[PDB]
Structure 1
Amino acid sequence: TEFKAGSAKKGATLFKTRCLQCHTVEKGGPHKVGPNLHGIFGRHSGQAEGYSYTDANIKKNVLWDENNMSEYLTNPKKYIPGTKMAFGGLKKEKDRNDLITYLKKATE
């Protein structure tokens, strides 16, 4: 199906009230609870510096796409976390679309 993008243009504030709990997108920002996400799309599944998490499912030599990330940002946990905690849907569908886009443009 289509991916929609920059609709509410709240994504960057959604992040601040969703992801900021656990992560940053600042330039090599602090690995607060999970790692920083700077250029996470243009990286792979967790070639984060520093934060040597377990991330077996994550790794599976995977790339991060707006889709793949949106899925990881959609389902309430279940994505084999182990590590600790995943949360899923921000609150709405269009929010996820917004978020992914903003966090795309933020660092890709």
Structure 2
Amino acid sequence: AEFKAGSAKKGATLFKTRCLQCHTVEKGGPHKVGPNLHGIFGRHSGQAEGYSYTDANIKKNVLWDENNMSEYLTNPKKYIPGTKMAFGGLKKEKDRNDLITYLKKATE
């Protein structure tokens, strides 16, 4: 994938409606269904403090960046088989670009 900056505004709507149920983004935020995502960019998978991951997520050991995040969000179970993240994916490039533009800002 080749991330291209999009609309953080639209990305925020995508995050609220599709991700927020399971994830928080702020520093020291709680673990809902999934892990808090503060500082996710530049960190490896399966390493948020206090969260219990699948072995698959931990074994994947991916160093998250905007490009492999886009691939992941296209179809998470195809990128990390065995993950317990219940999310089908976002097929549209624009949606992934907008969401990741938001996520970069919201989790930094």
Q: Determine the C-alpha separation between the residues in 1 that align with 2:48 and 2:8.
A: 29
Q: Determine the C-alpha separation between the residues in 2 that align with 1:60 and 1:89.
A: 18
**CA displacement, residues 27-61 of structure 1 (integer Å, 9 cap, x when unaligned):** 22111001000011122112111112124344443
Question: Which secondary structure does the structure 1 equivalent of 2:57 belong to?
Answer: helix
My pick for the range that moved more, 37-46 or 71-80, is 71-80
Is the contact between residue 24 and residue 37 of structure 1 (CA under 8 Å) also seen in structure 2? Answer: yes
Q: Determine the C-alpha separation between the residues in 1 that align with 2:80 and 2:6.
A: 29
Deviation at 1:26, TM superposition (A): 1.9
**CA displacement, residues 63-91 of structure 1 (integer Å, 9 cap, x when unaligned):** 00111111111026333453533324336
Q: 1:65 to 1:88 in 2, by over 3 A?
A: farther
Question: Which secondary structure does the structure 1 equivalent of 2:74 belong to?
Answer: coil
Larger helix share, 1 or 2:
2
Is the contact between residue 14 and residue 95 of structure 1 (CA under 8 Å) also seen in structure 2? Answer: yes
Give me the CA root mean square deviation. 2.3
Is the contact between residue 30 and residue 36 of structure 2 (CA under 8 Å) also seen in structure 1? Answer: yes
Q: 1:71 to 1:13 in 2, by over 3 A?
A: same
**CA displacement, residues 5-29 of structure 1 (integer Å, 9 cap, x when unaligned):** 1237311121011111211112221
Q: 1:26 to 1:43 in 2, by over 3 A?
A: same
- After TM superposition, the score normalised by the length of structure 2 is 0.81
Is the contact between residue 12 and residue 102 of structure 1 (CA under 8 Å) also seen in structure 2? Answer: yes
Q: Determine the C-alpha separation between the residues in 1 that align with 2:76 and 2:48.
A: 23
Same amino acid, percent of matched pairs? 99
Report whether the alignment pairs 1:15 with 2:15: yes
Gaps of 5+ in 2: none
